[PDB]
Amino acid sequence: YLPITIDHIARVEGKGGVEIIIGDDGVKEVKLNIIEGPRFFEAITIGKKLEEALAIYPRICSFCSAAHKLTALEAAEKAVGFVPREEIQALREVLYIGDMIESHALHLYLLVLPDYRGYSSPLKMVNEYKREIEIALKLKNLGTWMMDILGSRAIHQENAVLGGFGKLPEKSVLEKMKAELREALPLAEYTFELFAKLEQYSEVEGPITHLAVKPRGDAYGIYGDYIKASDGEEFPSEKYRDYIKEFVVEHSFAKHSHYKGRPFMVGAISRVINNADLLYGKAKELYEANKDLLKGTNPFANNLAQALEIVYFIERAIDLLDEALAKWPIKPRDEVEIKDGFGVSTTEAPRGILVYALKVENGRVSYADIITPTAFNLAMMEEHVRMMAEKHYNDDPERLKILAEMVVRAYDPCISCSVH
């Protein structure tokens, strides 16, 4: 017959398209067409000055601009042999938590909520689900205001400089930020309940290899030096290309990734599965209560894991703000002298593991390698869409299209970071 094609996928970051190649024996082939243009960030930054090249890395995507900026700062500081102070690292973690809060709330409420609630746009949900949109806006505004205070803006933060910040806010602003996080914790609880009420489709049940970062310190977090797996093994961050293979498929501008010859998953659910025992507080209480839903076999648990991570990161940000306030006043930035080196930083983005490998030669970037969470997740996305489509084969085309789109949106895909 003819393939069932979605030319443009909506409520998904970036330009993409699914292609379900139908056949006699159910589904025959699934291609994830990535038509977002290549920007060659790994090549346009080569030979550019380090400080100027770091300012354009967050332009890969807007949903995780702070992720790119802070991972690039970590890579550059590792390359130049610089160690940030503890309070500066805490403030950077607060900024990253703001990015995670904004991205997760935005995803959950404006991209995977309307298709569960029977709409085609969150702008059509203003009169019926008023309270849900109100709490969505409050969480998004909290994340955006944290990023506005710490970084220069919510998108493409400029206050995050090499060795710290250009200007740090006053103490009262940090106290207000802590108070607003305390006020937003009940909103995180309501979000977790609302997304626990939803459904994990059984058509996509299968064994998943979950890769996540091992946190630095003794708490669930974002910065790490080791990458864990659901198979139990763990490898150093700098040795990522010994165990992860990047190959180019003839249907997308992105590089698919394989782990021991098999697709794998990174994201919030992988984070929960790998580092569940490191949770503390209301997050640990909620995880212990709802461990039945958070099985590392269904890709649709990712949304609930995102809600749980919002709940965790609000309290984590409160604690980090307390740690930073214990050392007031803070000098905004340390003098960094650019020696040659090679730094690989694997910080955990809102959508999975972000790998930044930067080599510095005479104050300039000579080698750039970026592997993004969506590039990690694309192969598993293809496999799970294949099983979903074979489960819903020969049905009405509209129902197959919407269910495949829901499966794709469960992975919170950022097509822009795939191509970088």
Next chain:
Amino acid sequence: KVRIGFYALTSCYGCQLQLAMMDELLQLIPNAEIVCWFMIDRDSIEDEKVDIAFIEGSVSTEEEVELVKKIRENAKIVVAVGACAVQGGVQSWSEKPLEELWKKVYGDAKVKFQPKKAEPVSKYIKVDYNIYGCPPEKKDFLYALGTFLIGSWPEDIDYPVCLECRLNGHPCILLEKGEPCLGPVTRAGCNARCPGFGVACIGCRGAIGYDVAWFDSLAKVFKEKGMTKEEIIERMKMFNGHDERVEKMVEKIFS
């Protein structure tokens, strides 16, 4: 009702995200009918008659040139949003040809999709109005949308970031630390964010049009503080990579 369509070229979706995160966008729904915006809407049709078209991103695919020609056919007003649509963005920082970058990034492999070097939307169609920034400010979107809703059009900006830097009382980084601030030649509207946070401007909003962007004077100021010609040219071409004025004006002062 004004029919508004937001279209995505090769972009980071920062401009669409900035428009989506505005609380005043809820006021646009009763006054304007959103036709094409795939980020928020799913019932959006690409080939439809729109009163005002907002285009985001650079032209880095042949399919994108076909799309922008179609948009110019289908729109009464075409507005270029962001530095990617206005001046090619940071993707046009490198002057290296497409095959070199392709070999460096993707190796010797085929994708079956045709890419091209980043170019502004104004190269392939006629953009009536521009919205500057990376991402553009919420105030820029508010002013543009409001003036379009009243039936007027936004006023183009021909004043530098230094105006808003001096209105806010920010210390001048170029006078104190000698940092390479591109503010004196960059369009205002950002309220001097980077100089207010102690950082130097990188010219995200773009260089002033109407031939009143003085790269030669700024290059002389940079040269007095110990910068080579190529450093100044790269700094100025970070976001102005499709500007023919920069090379000529800097080579004049370094000759």
Next chain:
Amino acid sequence: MMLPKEIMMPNDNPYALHRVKVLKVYSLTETEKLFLFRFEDPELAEKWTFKPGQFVQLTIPGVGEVPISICSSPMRKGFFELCIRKAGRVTTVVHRLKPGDTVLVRGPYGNGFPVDEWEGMDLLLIAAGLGTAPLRSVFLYAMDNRWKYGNITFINTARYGKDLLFYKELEAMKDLAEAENVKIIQSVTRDPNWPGLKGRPQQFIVEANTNPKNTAVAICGPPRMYKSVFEALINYGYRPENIFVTLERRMKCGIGKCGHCNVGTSTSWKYICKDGPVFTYFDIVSTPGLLD
């Protein structure tokens, strides 16, 4: 004029705007419309008087405000007229105004032609292009007060024959004007196929019916014609103390604060909204840069 509490509001705010309504719209040329206005406040409408040559600030709500000269006579009380050419944003919005719409006006501003000290002497008015409207105000004031002024002449010129301002009114007025000591001369410059007169105003100054030693001269138009008109007027014997011209610069307020309508040099620094727009011949002669 010096209207109190209506030019600066009881709130003492000089930027305060008055509500006016557009009653008649009339297309003079393609890029030209004549608007008839009245104030929605009846007392303000009956009390608002101006001077010939003064201008007003027309605030279209939400777009901006522009300075427009008043073309109707101040003795036509209750109503005033504005002639507006479509040059850009604000005027594009203005040209969409249909009768019965409400727009905001403050004024009058500047100094007009000194028509009070022109008593008992001839009038020569030289209008080029869009400068007909302030001279239309002066001409209609003279026609309403015919016993006060002697022989009057009105020279109106334009680039093309279709761009002549108030061609219908002045052509209809010519009869009984020739018998009423009024001469109307209308000429074109870039149209060699125009049936009527052709040439620049300096050619038609010799055809005037005014006594050169007792004539007040009011010139309005582009600044580039002023030098040639001055040469022609000086050659024919018109006294330099009686020659008056109008100048235009960028205006944002009209009260003297925004500093955009600046002319002159460090020796004589002046502002159009506060020292003009009507300037004397010796002011134009003394400081260069006021022309072009």
